[PDB]
């Protein structure tokens, strides 16, 4: 329904308004065990990793008042990692998770209200 979609956008927008990290990742080459393994490593219950469709992400980021973050979610498969408080460890966790696996892309995101690029992910990790 229009109402169901609005609720999903509003909930996501509200979550992005209190996040300390939003990091965009291609979901390519991620196995079912890998999906449970990455979440399990993210151990502490303050972080989430979810495959989210672009249209939801875009509306949610737009209403959370984010800008220039469109490129991370532009024309690509887009899982999201969003953590709370000490956000640096979450980036290292996902960075060592790909490296352990065959491959995975790490597009970029926002750290503590600041845009970073794909190349800057290694710096944080």
């Amino acid at each position: 329904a229009k109402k169901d979609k609005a609720q999903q956008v509003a909930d996501v927008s509200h979550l992005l308004s209190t996040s300390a990290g939003f990091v965009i990742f291609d979901y390519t080459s991620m196995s079912a065990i890998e999906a449970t393994s990455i979440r399990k490593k993210l151990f502490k219950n303050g972080s989430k990793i979810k495959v989210i469709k672009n249209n939801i992400l875009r509306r949610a980021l737009k209403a959370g008042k984010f800008e220039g973050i469109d490129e991370t979610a532009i024309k690509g498969k887009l899982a999201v990692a969003v953590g709370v408080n000490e956000i640096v460890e979450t980036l290292k966790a996902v960075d060592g998770v790909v490296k352990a696996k065959e491959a995975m892309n790490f597009v970029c995101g926002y750290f503590d209200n600041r845009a970073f690029n794909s190349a800057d992910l290694e710096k944080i990790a």
Partner: protein
């Protein structure tokens, strides 16, 4: 990757992993090492196959729902689910779920209970 149910007390008569380029003589000692804590049981083992003929192995628990027969006190469950032959306390299910944790991919102990609850119902056992 070829999974096999190699017995824990014995590993020596055999060839279906020999076409993988596995050096059988070097790994038979390893199967009888870590498995010696659970001798007399048939332990499943995952076998990854690296290109360089290196190999690393992961042992697993004895198959699920076999333990449910022991907790129920009855050698075999009903052939018909509506026929409630046996009953098991929820506290006894906690003891069973903990054993399976290494095999189970369950996120929580409370979820690990729920996974075993779908196995107890297969035997027709009441959850009390």
């Amino acid at each position: 990757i070829a999974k096999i149910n190699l017995l824990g007390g014995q590993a020596k008569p055999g060839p279906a992993l020999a076409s993988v380029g596995i050096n059988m003589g070097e790994f038979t000692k390893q199967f009888n090492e870590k498995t010696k804590d659970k001798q007399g049981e048939m332990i499943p083992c995952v076998i990854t196959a690296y290109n360089d003929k290196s190999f690393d192995f992961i042992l697993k628990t004895t198959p699920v729902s076999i333990l449910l027969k022991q907790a129920a006190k009855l050698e075999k469950g009903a052939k018909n689910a509506k026929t409630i032959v046996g009953k098991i306390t929820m506290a006894k299910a906690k003891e069973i779920a903990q054993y399976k944790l290494v095999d189970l991919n369950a996120n929580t102990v409370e979820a690990a209970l729920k996974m075993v609850l779908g196995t107890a119902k297969q035997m027709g056992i009441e959850v009390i």
